[PDB]
Design an enzyme around this catalytic site. Structure first.
Site, PDB file in Angstrom:
ATOM      1  N   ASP A 251       6.454  -3.371 -12.545  1.00 57.75           N
ATOM      2  CA  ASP A 251       5.882  -4.679 -11.330  1.00 57.75           C
ATOM      3  C   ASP A 251       4.591  -4.841 -12.076  1.00 57.75           C
ATOM      4  O   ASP A 251       3.530  -4.389 -11.358  1.00 57.75           O
ATOM      5  CB  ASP A 251       5.481  -2.980 -10.031  1.00 57.75           C
TER       6      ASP A 251
ATOM      7  N   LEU B  36      -8.026   3.273   1.404  1.00 58.60           N
ATOM      8  CA  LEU B  36      -8.035   2.454   0.408  1.00 58.60           C
ATOM      9  C   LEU B  36      -7.356   1.306   0.620  1.00 58.60           C
ATOM     10  O   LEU B  36      -7.932  -0.315   0.848  1.00 58.60           O
ATOM     11  CB  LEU B  36      -8.433   2.570  -0.939  1.00 58.60           C
ATOM     12  N   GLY B  37      -6.351   1.299   1.199  1.00 60.01           N
ATOM     13  CA  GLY B  37      -5.377  -0.319   1.498  1.00 60.01           C
ATOM     14  C   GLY B  37      -4.213   0.967   1.252  1.00 60.01           C
ATOM     15  O   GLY B  37      -3.138   2.033   1.114  1.00 60.01           O
TER      16      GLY B  37
ATOM     17  N   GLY C  41       0.805  -0.030   1.978  1.00 63.22           N
ATOM     18  CA  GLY C  41       2.010  -0.765   1.943  1.00 63.22           C
ATOM     19  C   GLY C  41       3.164  -0.906   1.488  1.00 63.22           C
ATOM     20  O   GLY C  41       3.220   0.727   1.426  1.00 63.22           O
TER      21      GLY C  41
ATOM     22  N   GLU D 126      -6.871   9.558 -10.451  1.00 62.78           N
ATOM     23  CA  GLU D 126      -8.140   9.448 -10.469  1.00 62.78           C
ATOM     24  C   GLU D 126      -9.215   7.915 -10.468  1.00 62.78           C
ATOM     25  O   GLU D 126      -8.009   7.117  -9.865  1.00 62.78           O
ATOM     26  CB  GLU D 126      -8.145   8.918 -12.585  1.00 62.78           C
TER      27      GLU D 126
ATOM     28  N   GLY E 175       2.668   2.988  -0.056  1.00 64.32           N
ATOM     29  CA  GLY E 175       2.318   3.773   0.336  1.00 64.32           C
ATOM     30  C   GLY E 175       1.061   3.386   1.166  1.00 64.32           C
ATOM     31  O   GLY E 175       0.597   2.591   1.546  1.00 64.32           O
TER      32      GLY E 175
END
Ligand SMILES: Cn1c(-c2ccc(N3CCNCC3)cc2)cc2c(C#N)ccnc21
Length: 270
Positions: free
Chosen positions: A131, A11-12, A14, A85, A17
């Site tokens: 953040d 999914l991504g 950076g 989730e 992680g």
């Protein structure tokens, strides 16, 4: 154990992680499989029992659908694996704002209200997120519910002063830029002020430390006088002049919020 979970698309990745789409094969529930290399871990807490990343401590303390729930976790030789989730379908608020630009104030009111209710939950659990931004907010497009994510930059909430920060600099308050000192709640209201401006104007108001220090807000989109007032209030330079979560949710602009499903039927094509 990746016999218990089925791995899907990346999914991504950076600074947090690498997160994968996944399925818990026991019941076919959608999950997210986050990976964290141990050498890239900044802050280590430890469970009441062993040394874990501080993100695991915080996640268990706040684990409600305003905050993403930590389902399981594993320790590998050189990495930690988190099972979180995963709604379905999802779009994080950053992409949602990139595609649609500045949001209607009725939609921003709903989105901003839930984030307020979401971080109110984090503080009540003793967790400071540190953040808050649109990248770290997921939209459950069917239910119209925002979920807070990425506790890899947060800390245990404390009433004394902080001197460390590993979050997003354009969202950090001016007291951190000048003095490398801040208090959690007042710094959170600042980043919430940046978040509210980002939603109603389509982009964040500051990009350089000079603008953060000056604290002068220019509005590049048509914004109601009420929403401008609450934004400038959250962005007051002195932290004690900033509003509280209660003062924010009593603000004239925060009245008569839509329920989350109402938000999805009107604004999310649900
Ligand atoms: C951390 N994380 C991301 C996520 C992180 C970054 C992006 N993006 C980076 C910016 N460009 C757009 C893609 C998209 C999703 C999704 C999830 C989910 C879910 N479901 C669960 C736990 N954690 C997550």
């Amino acid at each position: 154990l990746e016999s218990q979970y089925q791995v899907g698309p990346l999914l991504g990745s950076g600074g947090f992680g690498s997160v994968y789409s996944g399925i818990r094969v026991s019941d076919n529930l959608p999950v997210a499989i986050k990976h964290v290399e141990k050498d890239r871990i900044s802050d280590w807490g430890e469970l009441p029992n062993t040394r874990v990343p501080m993100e695991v401590v915080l996640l268990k303390k706040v684990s409600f659908s305003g905050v993403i729930r930590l389902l399981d976790w594993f320790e590998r030789p050189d990495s930690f694996v988190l099972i979180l989730e995963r709604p379905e379908p999802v779009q994080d608020l950053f992409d949602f704002i990139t595609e649609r630009g500045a949001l209607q104030e009725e939609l921003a009111r709903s989105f901003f209200w839930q984030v307020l209710e979401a971080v109110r939950h984090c503080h009540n659990c003793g967790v400071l997120h540190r953040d808050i931004k649109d990248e770290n907010i997921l939209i459950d497009l069917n239910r119209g519910e925002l979920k807070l994510i990425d506790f890899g930059s947060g800390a245990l909430l404390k009433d004394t002063v902080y001197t460390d920060f590993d979050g997003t600099r354009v969202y950090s308050p001016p007291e951190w830029i000048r003095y490398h000192r801040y208090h959690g709640r007042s710094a959170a209201v600042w980043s919430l002020g940046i978040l509210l401006y980002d939603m109603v104007c389509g982009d964040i108001p500051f990009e350089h430390d000079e603008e953060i220090i000056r604290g002068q807000v220019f509005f590049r989109q048509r914004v109601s006088s009420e929403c401008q007032h609450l934004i400038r209030w959250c962005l007051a330079l002195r932290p004690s002049d900033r509003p509280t979560f209660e003062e924010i949710q009593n603000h004239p602009w925060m009245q008569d919020v839509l329920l989350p499903q109402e938000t999805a039927e009107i604004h999310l094509h649900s």
